[PDB]
Amino acid sequence: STIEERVKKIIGEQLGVKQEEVTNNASFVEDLGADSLDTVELVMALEEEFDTEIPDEEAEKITTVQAAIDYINGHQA
């Protein structure tokens, strides 16, 4: 599985949304129905899956599927 696929799987599992909705340009809140508690938990889940620490300054900008993919691809453990 690629990084893109694994990031999308984490997002779908954390947010409780079907795979078809997890398009690259989808917004967690606006498209995937997330609340802000969920987005914090999603960031934590990405840290565990990819063994990486995400600083707040960057976490705050992770609001779409693509932004999460880009963060993880750009910080490979």
Ligand SMILES: [Zn+2]
């Ligand atoms: Zn594949």
Ligand SMILES: [Zn+2]
């Ligand atoms: Zn899974």
Ligand SMILES: [Zn+2]
């Ligand atoms: Zn749905």
Ligand SMILES: [Zn+2]
């Ligand atoms: Zn659709």
Ligand SMILES: [Zn+2]
């Ligand atoms: Zn609204």
Ligand SMILES: [Zn+2]
């Ligand atoms: Zn919770």
Ligand SMILES: [Zn+2]
């Ligand atoms: Zn941990």
Ligand SMILES: [Zn+2]
């Ligand atoms: Zn945070």
Ligand SMILES: [Zn+2]
């Ligand atoms: Zn924050």
Ligand SMILES: [Zn+2]
């Ligand atoms: Zn960084």
